A and B are shown apart, each in its own frame.
Chain A
Amino acid sequence: VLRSVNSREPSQVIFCNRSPRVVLPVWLNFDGEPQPYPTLPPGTGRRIHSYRGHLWLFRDAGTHDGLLVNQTELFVPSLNPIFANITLPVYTLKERCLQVVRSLVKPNYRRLDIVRSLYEDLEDHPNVQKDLERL
């Protein structure tokens, strides 16, 4: 369902990483499969050649945390270049805590002293395929 439209109409895009994370751009091909592209260091930009009707989402390249592009999840290049403003979302305090704890404990998760439902929250890593079924 979530797939790019094979319109063959070029659309110039600027991937603008206004976030402290290493951004991993993800193109959804014509069969819905997520395709990864070269990453963007924090504060860096890149001019890419895409097409109208194509689907792009952006994540943390290291942790796959969700990121916003133009204050939304999905970015679709339109008629011309279009700016793709990649920013941090306002994470919930819980998810933000899971992010910090995940970055310090190796998936030794059970060895922590927390409730059992918090272990399953730590193991439920952010994942592009999980979010695709959600959308």
Chain B
Amino acid sequence: MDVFLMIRRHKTTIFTDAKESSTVFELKRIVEGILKRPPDEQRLYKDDQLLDDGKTLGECGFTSQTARPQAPATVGLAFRTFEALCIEPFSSPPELPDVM
């Protein structure tokens, strides 16, 4: 079963999917192919919690009906000592026009 994710670090945001049965380390292999960083220099997070390499995305709370295509779940990324988990927020939308 597919889960749809946003892997985010600093001002980087990767849109990808993975199997619910796939492991955290296997996600780091996906990140490795894109950002060219080995998994040992990678740290994956759900919100603030550090994720274990051997656990599957489903055990980590990334389920199909919470990681939707039109609303993907966020996986925090941190590079290596290790930096602190930093995710730059998106820009703020303007005020609603008077006609809305």
Residues of A within 8 A of B (CB): 101, 104-106, 108, 111-113
Contact = CB atoms under 8 A, between A and B. Distances in A.
- Most chain A CB within 10 A, of B97, B98, B99, is at B99
Interface in B81-100: 97-100
Main secondary structure of the interface of B (DSSP, over half): loop
Contacts of A104: 99-100
B97 A106 contact: no
A105 B99 CA distance: 6
Contacts of A112: 97, 99
Interface of B: 97-100
Nearest to A113: B97
Contacts of A108: 99
B3 to A, nearest CB: 20
Contacts of A113: 97
A104 B98 CA distance: 11
Contacts of B100: 101, 104-105
Given A104-B99, A112-B99, A113-B97, 10 more contacts: A101-B100, A104-B100, A105-B99, A105-B100, A106-B99, A108-B99, A111-B97, A111-B98, A111-B99, A112-B97
13 contacts: A101-B100, A104-B99, A104-B100, A105-B99, A105-B100, A106-B99, A108-B99, A111-B97, A111-B98, A111-B99, A112-B97, A112-B99, A113-B97
Contacts of B98: 111
Nearest to B100: A104
A111 B100 CA distance: 10
Contacts of B99: 104-106, 108, 111-112
A105 B98 CA distance: 9
Contacts of B97: 111-113
A126 B98 CA distance: 25
Nearest to A108: B99
Nearest to A105: B99
